[PDB]
Short mmCIF file of C-alpha atoms and ligand atoms in Angstrom, two decimals:
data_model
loop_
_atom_site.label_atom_id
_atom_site.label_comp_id
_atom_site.label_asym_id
_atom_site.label_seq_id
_atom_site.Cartn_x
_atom_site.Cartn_y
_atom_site.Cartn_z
CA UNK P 1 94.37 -55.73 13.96
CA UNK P 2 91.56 -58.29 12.45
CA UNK P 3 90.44 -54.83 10.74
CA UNK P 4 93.52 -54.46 9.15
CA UNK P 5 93.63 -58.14 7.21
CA UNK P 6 90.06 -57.85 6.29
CA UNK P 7 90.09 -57.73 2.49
CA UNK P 8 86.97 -55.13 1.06
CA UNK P 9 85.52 -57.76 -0.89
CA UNK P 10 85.27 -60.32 1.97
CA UNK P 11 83.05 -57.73 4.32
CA UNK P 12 79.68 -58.95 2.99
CA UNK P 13 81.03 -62.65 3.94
CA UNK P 14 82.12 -61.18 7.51
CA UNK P 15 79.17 -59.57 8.20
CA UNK P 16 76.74 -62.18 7.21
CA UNK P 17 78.94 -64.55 9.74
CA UNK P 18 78.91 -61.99 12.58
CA UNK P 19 75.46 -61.44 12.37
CA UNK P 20 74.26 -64.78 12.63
CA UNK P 21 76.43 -64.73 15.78
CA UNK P 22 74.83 -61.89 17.20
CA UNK P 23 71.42 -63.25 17.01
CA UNK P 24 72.56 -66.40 18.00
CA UNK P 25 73.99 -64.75 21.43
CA UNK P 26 70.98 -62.69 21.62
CA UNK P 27 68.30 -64.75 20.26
CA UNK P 28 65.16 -61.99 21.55
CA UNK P 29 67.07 -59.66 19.37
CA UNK P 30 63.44 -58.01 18.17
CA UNK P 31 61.97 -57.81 21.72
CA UNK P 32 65.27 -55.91 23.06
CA UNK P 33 64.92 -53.24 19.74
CA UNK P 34 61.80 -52.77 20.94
CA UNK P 35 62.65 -52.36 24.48
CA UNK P 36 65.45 -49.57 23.15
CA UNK P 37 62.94 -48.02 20.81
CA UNK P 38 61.04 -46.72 23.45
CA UNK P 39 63.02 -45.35 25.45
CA UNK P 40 64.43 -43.56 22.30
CA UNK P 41 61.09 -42.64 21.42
CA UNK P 42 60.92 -40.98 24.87
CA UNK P 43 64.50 -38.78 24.41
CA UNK P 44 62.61 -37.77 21.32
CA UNK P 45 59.68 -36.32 22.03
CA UNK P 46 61.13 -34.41 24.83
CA UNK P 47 63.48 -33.05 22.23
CA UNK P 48 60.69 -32.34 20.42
CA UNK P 49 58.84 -30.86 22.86
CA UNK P 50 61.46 -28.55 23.68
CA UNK P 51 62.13 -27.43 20.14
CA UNK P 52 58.37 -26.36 20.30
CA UNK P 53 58.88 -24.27 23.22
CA UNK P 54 61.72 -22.13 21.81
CA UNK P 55 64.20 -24.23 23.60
CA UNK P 56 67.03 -25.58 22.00
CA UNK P 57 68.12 -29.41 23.70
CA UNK P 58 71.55 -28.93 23.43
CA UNK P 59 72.99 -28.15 26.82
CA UNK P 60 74.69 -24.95 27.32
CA UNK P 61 77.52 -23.98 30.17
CA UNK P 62 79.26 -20.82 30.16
CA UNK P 63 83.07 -21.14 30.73
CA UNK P 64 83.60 -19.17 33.48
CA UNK P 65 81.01 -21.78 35.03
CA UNK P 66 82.99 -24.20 34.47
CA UNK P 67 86.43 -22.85 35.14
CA UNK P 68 85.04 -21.44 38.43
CA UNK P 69 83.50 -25.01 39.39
CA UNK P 70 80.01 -23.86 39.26
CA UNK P 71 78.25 -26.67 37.04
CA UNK P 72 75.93 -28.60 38.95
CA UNK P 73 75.35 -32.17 38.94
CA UNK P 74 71.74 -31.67 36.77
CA UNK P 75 73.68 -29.95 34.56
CA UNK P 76 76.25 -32.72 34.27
CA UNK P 77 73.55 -35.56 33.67
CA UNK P 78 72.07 -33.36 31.30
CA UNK P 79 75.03 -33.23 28.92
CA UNK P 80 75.67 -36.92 29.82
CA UNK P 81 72.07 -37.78 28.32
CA UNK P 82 72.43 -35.38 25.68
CA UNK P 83 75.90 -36.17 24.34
CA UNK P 84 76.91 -32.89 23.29
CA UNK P 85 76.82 -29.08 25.29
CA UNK P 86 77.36 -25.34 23.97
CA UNK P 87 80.30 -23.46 25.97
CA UNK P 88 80.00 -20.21 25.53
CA UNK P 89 82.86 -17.47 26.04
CA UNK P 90 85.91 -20.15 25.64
CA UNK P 91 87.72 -16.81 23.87
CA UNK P 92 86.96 -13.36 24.12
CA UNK P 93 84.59 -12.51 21.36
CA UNK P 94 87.28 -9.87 19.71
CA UNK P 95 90.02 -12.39 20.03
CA UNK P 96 88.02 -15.13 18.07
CA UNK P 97 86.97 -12.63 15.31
CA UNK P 98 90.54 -11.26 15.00
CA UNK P 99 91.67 -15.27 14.30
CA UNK P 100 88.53 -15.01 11.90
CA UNK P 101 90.11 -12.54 9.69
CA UNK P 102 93.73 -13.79 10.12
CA UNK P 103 93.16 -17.54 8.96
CA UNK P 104 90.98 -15.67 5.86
CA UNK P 105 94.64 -13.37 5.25
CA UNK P 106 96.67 -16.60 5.77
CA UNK P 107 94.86 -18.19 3.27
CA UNK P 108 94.81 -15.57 1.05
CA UNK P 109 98.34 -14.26 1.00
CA UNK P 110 99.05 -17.71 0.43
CA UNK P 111 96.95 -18.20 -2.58
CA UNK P 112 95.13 -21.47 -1.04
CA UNK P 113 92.59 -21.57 -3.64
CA UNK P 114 94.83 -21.32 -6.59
CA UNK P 115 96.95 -24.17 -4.88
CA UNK P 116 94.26 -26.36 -4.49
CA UNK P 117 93.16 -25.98 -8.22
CA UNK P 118 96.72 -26.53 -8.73
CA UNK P 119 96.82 -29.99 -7.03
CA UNK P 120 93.82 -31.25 -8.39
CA UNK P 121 93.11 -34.34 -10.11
CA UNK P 122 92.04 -33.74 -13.59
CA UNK P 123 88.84 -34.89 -13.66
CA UNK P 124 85.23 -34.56 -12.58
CA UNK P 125 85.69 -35.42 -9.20
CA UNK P 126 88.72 -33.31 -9.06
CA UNK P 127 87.64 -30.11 -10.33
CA UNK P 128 84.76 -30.72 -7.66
CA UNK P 129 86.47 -31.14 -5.04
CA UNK P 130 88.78 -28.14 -5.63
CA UNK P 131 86.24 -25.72 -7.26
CA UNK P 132 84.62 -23.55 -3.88
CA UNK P 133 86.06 -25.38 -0.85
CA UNK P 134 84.41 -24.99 2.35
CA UNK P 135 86.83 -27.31 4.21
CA UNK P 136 90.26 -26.15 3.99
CA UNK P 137 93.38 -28.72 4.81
CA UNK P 138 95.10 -26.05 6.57
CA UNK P 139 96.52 -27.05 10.22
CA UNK P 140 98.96 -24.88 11.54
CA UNK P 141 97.74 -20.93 11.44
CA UNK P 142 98.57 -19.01 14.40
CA UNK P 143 95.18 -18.75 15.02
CA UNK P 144 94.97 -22.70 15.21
CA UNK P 145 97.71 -23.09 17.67
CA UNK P 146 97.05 -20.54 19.87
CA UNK P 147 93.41 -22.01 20.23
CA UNK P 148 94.22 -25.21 21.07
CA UNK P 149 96.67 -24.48 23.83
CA UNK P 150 94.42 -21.91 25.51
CA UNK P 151 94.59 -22.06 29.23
CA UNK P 152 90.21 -21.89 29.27
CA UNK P 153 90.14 -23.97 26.30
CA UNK P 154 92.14 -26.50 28.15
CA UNK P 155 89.72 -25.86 31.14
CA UNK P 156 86.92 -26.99 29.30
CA UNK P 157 88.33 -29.76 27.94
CA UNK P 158 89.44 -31.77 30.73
CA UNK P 159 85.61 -30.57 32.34
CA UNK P 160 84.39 -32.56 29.22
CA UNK P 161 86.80 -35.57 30.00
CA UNK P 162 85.88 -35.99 33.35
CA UNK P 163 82.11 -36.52 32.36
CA UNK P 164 83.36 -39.77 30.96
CA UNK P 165 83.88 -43.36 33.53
CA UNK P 166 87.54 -43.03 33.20
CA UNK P 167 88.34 -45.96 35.76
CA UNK P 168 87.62 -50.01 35.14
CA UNK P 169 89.19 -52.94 36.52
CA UNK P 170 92.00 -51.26 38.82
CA UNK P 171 92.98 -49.60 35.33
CA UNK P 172 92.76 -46.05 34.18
CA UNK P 173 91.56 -45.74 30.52
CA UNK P 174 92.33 -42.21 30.31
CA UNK P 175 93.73 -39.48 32.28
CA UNK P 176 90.87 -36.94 32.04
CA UNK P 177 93.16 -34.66 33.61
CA UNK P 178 95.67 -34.08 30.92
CA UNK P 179 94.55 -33.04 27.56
CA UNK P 180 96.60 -33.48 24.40
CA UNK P 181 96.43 -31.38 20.85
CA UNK P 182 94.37 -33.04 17.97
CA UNK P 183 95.65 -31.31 14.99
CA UNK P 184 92.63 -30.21 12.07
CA UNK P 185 91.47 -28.30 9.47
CA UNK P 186 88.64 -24.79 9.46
CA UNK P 187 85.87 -24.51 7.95
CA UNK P 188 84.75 -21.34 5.85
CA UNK P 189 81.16 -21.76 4.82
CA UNK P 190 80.15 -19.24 2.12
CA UNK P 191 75.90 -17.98 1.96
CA UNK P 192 74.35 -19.77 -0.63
CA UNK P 193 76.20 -22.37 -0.89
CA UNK P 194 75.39 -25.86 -1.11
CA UNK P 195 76.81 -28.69 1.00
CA UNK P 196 77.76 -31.49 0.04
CA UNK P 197 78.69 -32.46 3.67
CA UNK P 198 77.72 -36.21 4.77
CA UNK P 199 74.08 -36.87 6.23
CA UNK P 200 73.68 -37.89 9.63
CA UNK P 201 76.62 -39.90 10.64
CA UNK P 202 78.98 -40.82 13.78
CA UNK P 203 82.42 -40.63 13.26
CA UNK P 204 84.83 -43.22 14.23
CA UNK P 205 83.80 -46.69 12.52
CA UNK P 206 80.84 -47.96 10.65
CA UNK P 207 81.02 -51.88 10.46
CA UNK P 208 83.58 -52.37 12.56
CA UNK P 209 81.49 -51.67 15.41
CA UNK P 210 79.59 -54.76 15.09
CA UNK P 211 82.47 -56.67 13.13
CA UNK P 212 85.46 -55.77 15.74
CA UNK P 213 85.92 -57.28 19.15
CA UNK P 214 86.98 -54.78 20.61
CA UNK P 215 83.89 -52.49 19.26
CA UNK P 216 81.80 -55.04 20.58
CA UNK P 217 83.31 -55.10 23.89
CA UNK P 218 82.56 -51.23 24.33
CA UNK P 219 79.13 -52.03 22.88
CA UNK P 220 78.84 -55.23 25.37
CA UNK P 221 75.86 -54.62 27.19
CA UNK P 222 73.91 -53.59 24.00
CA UNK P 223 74.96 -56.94 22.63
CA UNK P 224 74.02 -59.38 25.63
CA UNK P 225 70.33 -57.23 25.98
CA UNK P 226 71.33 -55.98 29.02
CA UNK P 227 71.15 -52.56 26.98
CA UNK P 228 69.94 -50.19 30.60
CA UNK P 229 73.53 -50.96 31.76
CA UNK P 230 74.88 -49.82 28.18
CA UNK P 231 76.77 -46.17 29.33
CA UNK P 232 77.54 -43.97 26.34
CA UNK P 233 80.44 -42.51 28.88
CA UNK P 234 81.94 -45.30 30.04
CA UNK P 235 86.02 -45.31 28.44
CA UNK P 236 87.02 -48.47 29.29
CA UNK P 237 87.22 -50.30 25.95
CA UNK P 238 87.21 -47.11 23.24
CA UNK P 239 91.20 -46.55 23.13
CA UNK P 240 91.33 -50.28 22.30
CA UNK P 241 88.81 -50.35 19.18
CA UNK P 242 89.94 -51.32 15.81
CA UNK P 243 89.36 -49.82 12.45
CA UNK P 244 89.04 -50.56 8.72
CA UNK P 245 92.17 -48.77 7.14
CA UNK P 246 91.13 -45.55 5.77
CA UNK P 247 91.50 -41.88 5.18
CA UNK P 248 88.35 -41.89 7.52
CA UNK P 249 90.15 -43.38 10.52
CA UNK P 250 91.37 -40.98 13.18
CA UNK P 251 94.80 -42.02 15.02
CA UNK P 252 93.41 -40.75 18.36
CA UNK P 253 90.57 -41.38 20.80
CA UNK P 254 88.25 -38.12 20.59
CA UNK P 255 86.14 -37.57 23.63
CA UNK P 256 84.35 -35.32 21.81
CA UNK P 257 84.30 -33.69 18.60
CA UNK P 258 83.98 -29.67 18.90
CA UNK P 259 83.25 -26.51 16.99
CA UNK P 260 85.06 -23.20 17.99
CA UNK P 261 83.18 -20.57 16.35
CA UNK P 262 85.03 -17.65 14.41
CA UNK P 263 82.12 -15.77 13.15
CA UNK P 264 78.42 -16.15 15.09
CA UNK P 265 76.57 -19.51 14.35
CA UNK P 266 72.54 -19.43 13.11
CA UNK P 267 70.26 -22.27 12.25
CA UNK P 268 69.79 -21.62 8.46
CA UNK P 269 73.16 -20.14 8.14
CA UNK P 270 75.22 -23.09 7.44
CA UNK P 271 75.32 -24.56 11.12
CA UNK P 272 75.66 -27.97 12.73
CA UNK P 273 72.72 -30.19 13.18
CA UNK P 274 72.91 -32.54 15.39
CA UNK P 275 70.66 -36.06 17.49
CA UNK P 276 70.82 -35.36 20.97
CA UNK P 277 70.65 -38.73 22.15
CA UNK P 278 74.11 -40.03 23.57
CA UNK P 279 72.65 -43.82 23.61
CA UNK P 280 71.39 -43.28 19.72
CA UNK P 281 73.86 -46.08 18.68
CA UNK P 282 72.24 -48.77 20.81
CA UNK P 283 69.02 -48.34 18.51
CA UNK P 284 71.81 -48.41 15.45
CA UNK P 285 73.32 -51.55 16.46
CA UNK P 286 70.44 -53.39 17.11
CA UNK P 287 68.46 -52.08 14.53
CA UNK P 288 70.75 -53.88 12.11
CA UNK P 289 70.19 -57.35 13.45
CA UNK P 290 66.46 -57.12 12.91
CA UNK P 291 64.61 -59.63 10.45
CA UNK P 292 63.78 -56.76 7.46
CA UNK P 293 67.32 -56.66 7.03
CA UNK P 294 69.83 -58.71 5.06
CA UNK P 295 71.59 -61.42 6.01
CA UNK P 296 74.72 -59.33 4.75
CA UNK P 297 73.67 -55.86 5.60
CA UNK P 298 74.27 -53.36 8.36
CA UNK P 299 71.63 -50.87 7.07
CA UNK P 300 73.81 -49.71 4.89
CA UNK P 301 77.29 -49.30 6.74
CA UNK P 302 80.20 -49.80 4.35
CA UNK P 303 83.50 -49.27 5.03
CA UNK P 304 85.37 -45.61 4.91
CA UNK P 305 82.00 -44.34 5.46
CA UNK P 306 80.87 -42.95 8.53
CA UNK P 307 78.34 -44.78 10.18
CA UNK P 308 75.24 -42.93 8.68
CA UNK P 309 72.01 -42.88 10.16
CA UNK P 310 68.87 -42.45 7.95
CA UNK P 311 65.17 -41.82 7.20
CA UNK P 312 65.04 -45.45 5.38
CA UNK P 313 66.01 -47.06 8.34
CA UNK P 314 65.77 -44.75 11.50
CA UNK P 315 63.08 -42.66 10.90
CA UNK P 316 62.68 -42.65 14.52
CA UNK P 317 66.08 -40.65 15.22
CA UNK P 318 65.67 -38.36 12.07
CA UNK P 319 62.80 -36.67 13.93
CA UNK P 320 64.97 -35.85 16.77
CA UNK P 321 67.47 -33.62 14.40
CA UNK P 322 67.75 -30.43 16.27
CA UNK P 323 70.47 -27.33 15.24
CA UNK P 324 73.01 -26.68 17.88
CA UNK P 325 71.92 -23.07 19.66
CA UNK P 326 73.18 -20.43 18.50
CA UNK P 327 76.88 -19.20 19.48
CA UNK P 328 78.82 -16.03 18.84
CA UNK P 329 82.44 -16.07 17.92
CA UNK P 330 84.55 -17.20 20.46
CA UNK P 331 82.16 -19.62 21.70
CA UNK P 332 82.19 -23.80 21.15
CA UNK P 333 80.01 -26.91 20.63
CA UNK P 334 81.06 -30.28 21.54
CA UNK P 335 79.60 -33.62 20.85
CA UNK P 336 80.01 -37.14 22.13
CA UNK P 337 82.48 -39.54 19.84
CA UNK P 338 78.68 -41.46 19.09
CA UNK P 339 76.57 -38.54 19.02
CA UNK P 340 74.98 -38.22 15.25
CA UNK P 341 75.75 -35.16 13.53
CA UNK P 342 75.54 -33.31 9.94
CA UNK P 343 76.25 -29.79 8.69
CA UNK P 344 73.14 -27.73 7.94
CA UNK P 345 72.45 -27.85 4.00
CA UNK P 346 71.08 -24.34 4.38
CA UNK P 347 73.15 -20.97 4.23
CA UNK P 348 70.76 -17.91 3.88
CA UNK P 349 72.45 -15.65 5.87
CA UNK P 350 74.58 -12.58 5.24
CA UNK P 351 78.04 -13.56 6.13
CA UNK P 352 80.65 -16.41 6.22
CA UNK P 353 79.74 -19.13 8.88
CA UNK P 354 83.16 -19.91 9.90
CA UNK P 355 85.05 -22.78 12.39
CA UNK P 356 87.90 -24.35 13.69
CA UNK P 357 87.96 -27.93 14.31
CA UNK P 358 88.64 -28.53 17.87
CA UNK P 359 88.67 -31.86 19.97
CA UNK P 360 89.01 -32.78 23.34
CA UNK P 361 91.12 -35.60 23.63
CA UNK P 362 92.76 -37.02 27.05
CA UNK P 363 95.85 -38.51 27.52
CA UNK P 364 96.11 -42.06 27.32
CA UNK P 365 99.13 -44.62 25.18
CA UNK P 366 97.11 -44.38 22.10
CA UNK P 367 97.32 -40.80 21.70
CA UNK P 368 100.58 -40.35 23.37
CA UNK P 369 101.68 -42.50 20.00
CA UNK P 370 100.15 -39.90 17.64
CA UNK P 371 101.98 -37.11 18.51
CA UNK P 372 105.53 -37.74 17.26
CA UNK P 373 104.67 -38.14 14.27
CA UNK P 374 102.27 -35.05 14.36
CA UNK P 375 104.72 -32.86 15.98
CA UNK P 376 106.97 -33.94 13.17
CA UNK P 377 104.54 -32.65 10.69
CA UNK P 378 104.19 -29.55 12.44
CA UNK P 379 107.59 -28.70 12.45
CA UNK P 380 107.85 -29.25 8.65
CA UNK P 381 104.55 -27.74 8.24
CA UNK P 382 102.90 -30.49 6.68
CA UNK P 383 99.70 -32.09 6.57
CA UNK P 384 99.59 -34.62 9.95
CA UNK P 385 99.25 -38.44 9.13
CA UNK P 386 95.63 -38.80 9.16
CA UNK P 387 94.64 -36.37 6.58
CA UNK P 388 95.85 -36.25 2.60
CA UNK P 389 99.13 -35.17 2.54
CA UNK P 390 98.99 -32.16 0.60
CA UNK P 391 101.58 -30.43 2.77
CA UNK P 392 100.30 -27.07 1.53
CA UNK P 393 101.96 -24.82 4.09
CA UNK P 394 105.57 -26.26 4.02
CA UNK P 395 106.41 -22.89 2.46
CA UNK P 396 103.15 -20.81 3.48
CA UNK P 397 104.03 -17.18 5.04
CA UNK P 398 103.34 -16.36 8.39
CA UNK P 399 102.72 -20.34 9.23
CA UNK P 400 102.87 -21.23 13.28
CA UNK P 401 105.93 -22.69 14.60
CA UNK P 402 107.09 -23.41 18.08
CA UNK P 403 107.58 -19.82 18.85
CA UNK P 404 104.16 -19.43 18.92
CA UNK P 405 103.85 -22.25 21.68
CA UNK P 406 103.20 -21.59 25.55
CA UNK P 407 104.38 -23.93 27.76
CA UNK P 408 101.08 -25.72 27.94
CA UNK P 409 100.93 -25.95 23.89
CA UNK P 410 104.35 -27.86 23.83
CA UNK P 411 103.05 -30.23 26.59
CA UNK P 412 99.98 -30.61 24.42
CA UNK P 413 101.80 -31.68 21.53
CA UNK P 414 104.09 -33.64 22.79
CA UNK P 415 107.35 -31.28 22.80
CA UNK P 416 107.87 -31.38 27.00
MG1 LIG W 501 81.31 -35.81 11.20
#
């Protein structure tokens, strides 16, 4: 992994190399911007547009749809262009609101709070960190496992997967067919709180999508100007990409990124924001190589932060921010690995806005790798690999083990 040798302090070297290789290889760098700018400026004003009509432009499917086979090819295209749908009914409302209050009694019998206090640094950032958490490294409530192995929940994931070009070159990227369990935290968002959640970003990499091969393979036909042939859903390439080592990096290849909703969902009520534009990051990447920007600069990517996108320099895109619609509990929201996303910063409403974190993510060797050593930290109860290893429920009451598991939850996680 070139990603992996890459000291910190050499990146502003690196990129200043790669970049005057990009515009080498694409020396009408401005002209194809400009070609992508419009037809981003297109996307958003019919965003636009339909936020002005009371429409919201995130897709959204009911489940049943979609388990009985019902979604129509407009639909599809729609979610492809989109990046991102609302699935509504995944769980029965009562079901998800009953998880609701059991993942607030697991935390509490448990004394999270004082625990997280408790481990602490003791210091400024520290005490902020632990002081009113909204993101809590819990991974293994019942609620949490039963979720994930849902027989509709699995339904709707591999519908998701098989939007995505699985096939390339006589080889199969990913079996869209067979879904495996991500492990990750909840979310319990308090009214009136502040966030201090990250702005507009993609998850996934930041630099090393124009400093990594591999990246730039994916990214290919963004690179070479042929950026109409550039398909946000094509997999061949994304299990292969390479990261800067971080607590940021994910060990598996997320389709999508999802929301299942505890608690009902409201714009102004701590919800998710997101840019419904799946090709967004073709304007990111070649927005970087444009003359008003550094020789050494990727608009501001650095590494172990995700890729942000902003007002300085993509106005354009900021003023297609649109809040997902709004869901009840038991219902979902899934986004494209690329799409750009933020929590809101505002939380006037009445009640907790509360969610699980819940990928889809196909079978393929790089995520078949992942779960040993998550199932490992599942059995011991411990935080999984990617995320700080505060290993808070070793000894929490009531926490999931493989009892808990239907047969499809111990092929998800690797146990059959
Ligand atoms: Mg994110």
């Amino acid at each position: 992994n070139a990603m992996a040798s890459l000291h910190i302090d050499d990146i502003p070297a690196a990129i200043k190399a790669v970049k005057q290789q990009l515009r080498q290889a694409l020396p009408d760098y401005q002209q194809v911007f400009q070609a992508v700018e419009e037809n981003i400026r297109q996307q958003v004003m019919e965003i636009r547009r339909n936020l002005a009509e009371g429409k919201n432009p995130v897709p959204q499917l009911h489940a049943d749809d979609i388990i009985n086979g019902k979604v129509t090819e407009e639909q599809k295209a729609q979610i492809k262009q989109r990046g991102c749908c609302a699935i509504l009914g995944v769980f029965p409302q009562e079901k998800a609101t009953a998880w609701n209050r059991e993942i607030g009694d697991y935390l509490d019998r448990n004394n999270f709070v004082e625990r997280l206090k408790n481990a602490a640094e003791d210091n400024y950032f520290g005490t902020l960190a632990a002081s009113k958490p909204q993101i809590y490294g819990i991974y293994w409530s019942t609620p949490q496992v039963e979720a994930r192995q849902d027989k509709r929940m699995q339904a709707v994931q591999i519908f998701l997967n098989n939007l995505w070009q699985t096939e390339s070159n006589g080889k199969q990227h990913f079996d869209a067919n067979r879904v495996v369990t991500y492990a990750d935290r909840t979310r319990r968002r308090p009214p009136k709180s502040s966030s201090l959640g990250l702005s507009p970003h993609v998850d996934g990499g930041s630099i090393e999508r124009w400093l990594d091969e591999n990246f730039r393979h994916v990214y290919r036909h963004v690179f070479s100007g042929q950026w109409q042939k550039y398909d946000p859903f094509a997999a061949e390439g994304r299990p292969e990409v390479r990261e800067f080592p971080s607590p940021a990096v994910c060990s598996m290849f997320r389709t999508f990124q999802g929301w299942t909703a505890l608690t009902p969902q409201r714009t102004h009520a701590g919800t998710l924001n997101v840019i419904p534009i799946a090709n967004a990051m073709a304007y990111i990447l070649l927005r970087a190589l444009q003359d008003d920007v550094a020789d050494d600069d990727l608009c501001g990517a650095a590494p172990g932060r995700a890729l942000s996108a902003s007002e300085q320099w993509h106005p354009l895109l900021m003023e297609a921010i649109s809040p997902i619609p709004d869901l009840e509990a038991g219902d979902t929201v899934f986004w494209h690995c690329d799409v750009i996303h933020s929590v809101e910063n505002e939380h006037n409403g009445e009640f907790d806005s509360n969610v699980m974190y819940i990928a889809a993510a196909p079978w393929c060797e790089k995520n078949a790798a992942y779960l040993p050593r998550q199932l490992a930290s599942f059995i011991d109860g411990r935080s999984p690999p990617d995320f700080a290893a505060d290993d808070f429920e070793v000894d929490f009451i009531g926490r999931a083990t493989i009892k808990n598991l239907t047969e499809i939850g111990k092929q998800q996680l690797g146990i059959t």
